[PDB]
């Protein structure tokens, strides 16, 4: 049978903690946003013609608008204060390991289980950074408040040389490194 | 911008099913089990840090349902267009023989929010120890969903994440093996 979907997204955007907050209440019907309330404006605005009658009707209700105009404080800032300690301030250091991958084996640096997602992984060869000989999976979200990424060194390992994977992340004050002695 | 908290909720007809969840920078804080009318925290510890009264979510869904019936009529009963998902199977960490790990089946970029997901190990449906997330939001308004299967690596096992969605003509199977 045909499907009909109604979606509502109430978004709270935070800039520098709760210094600047923007509240957006967005309505979607079958993937099409038709009307929204933006705290920067203070009233509902039709996104498509389908939302014109809705915005017009709701905007004539001062009581409703007054409630929505108070959400940046009563909803956004309130909730931020309630969850910030275990979300905004959540920090889980990454587990770093290096393993060879298949007559030569390229070195792969696995960086997993970390949070937040911002991270920088670099490869070094005997102290010199291999700035352009690296390929990665990019950032992978595990859907459980952790991320991971694989960073492979394209340079063929030479016996005698030392390769080091360096990881910088908000959870550590100095780079985490794993050395591989070829 | 630095952080975003999104309260995402939906109602779907004719399935008569709805969901309600909070998202922080892409991760779920909690959702409400509509059937049990209870608050489900994504990570157990969250429940000792905060509280949410599930009933509020139920009342919201009732309103979304009412809005849906109205908007469906105003849009000439035009049905939603199916967008098939892309599926990726990966492990949460590098695989090692006698060290437990977790297989992740990531279902992405689809709508409507309805899917059948099955884990198969050597052709056997696995329903032991598995877990999954509710339908998560995307900035493009499509959905994301994660399924998990803790396992013990073995050169003798093969795995498949079988996904069904109305946007697909046949089941989509993503294979994985050590």
């Amino acid at each position: 049978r045909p499907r009909f979907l109604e979606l509502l997204k109430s978004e709270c955007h935070f800039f520098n903690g709760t210094e600047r907050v923007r509240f957006l209440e967005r309505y979607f019907h079958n993937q099409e946003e038709f009307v929204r309330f933006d705290s920067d404006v203070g009233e509902y605005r039709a996104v498509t013609e389908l939302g014109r009658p809705v915005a017009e009707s709701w905007n004539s209700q001062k009581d409703l608008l007054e409630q929505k105009r108070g959400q940046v404080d009563n909803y956004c800032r309130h909730n931020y204060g309630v969850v910030e300690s275990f979300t905004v301030q959540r920090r889980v250091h990454p587990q770093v390991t290096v393993y060879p991958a298949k007559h030569h084996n390229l070195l792969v640096c696995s960086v997993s289980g970390f949070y937040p997602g911002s991270i920088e992984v670099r490869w070094f060869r005997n102290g010199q950074e291999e700035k352009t000989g690296v390929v990665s999976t990019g950032l992978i979200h595990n859907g459980d408040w952790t991320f991971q990424t694989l960073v492979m060194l394209e340079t063929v390992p030479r016996s005698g040389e030392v390769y080091t994977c360096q990881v910088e992340h908000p959870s550590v004050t100095s780079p985490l490194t794993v050395e591989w002695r070829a | 911008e630095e952080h975003v908290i999104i309260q995402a909720e939906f109602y779907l007809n004719p399935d008569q099913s709805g969901e309600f969840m909070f998202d922080f920078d892409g991760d779920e804080i909690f959702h409400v089990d509509m059937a049990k009318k209870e608050t489900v925290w994504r990570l157990e510890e969250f429940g000792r840090f905060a509280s949410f009264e599930a009933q509020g979510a139920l009342a919201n869904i009732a309103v979304d349902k009412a809005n849906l019936e109205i908007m469906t009529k105003r849009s000439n009963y035009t049905p939603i267009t199916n967008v098939p998902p892309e599926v990726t199977v990966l492990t949460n960490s590098p695989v090692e023989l006698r060290e437990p790990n977790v297989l992740i089946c990531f279902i992405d970029k689809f709508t409507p929010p309805v899917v059948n997901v099955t884990w198969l190990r050597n052709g056997k449906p696995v329903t032991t120890g598995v877990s999954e997330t509710v339908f998560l939001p995307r900035e493009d308004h499509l959905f994301r969903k994660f399924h998990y299967l803790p396992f013990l690596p073995s050169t003798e096992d093969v795995y498949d994440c079988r996904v069904e969605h109305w946007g697909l003509d046949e089941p989509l199977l993503k294979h994985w093996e050590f």
Partner: peptide, 13 residues
């Protein structure tokens, strides 16, 4: 402590 929810506007029928 208490997470507060935002309520949907009711579209007129």
């Amino acid at each position: 402590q208490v997470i507060i929810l935002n309520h949907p506007g009711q579209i007129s029928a």
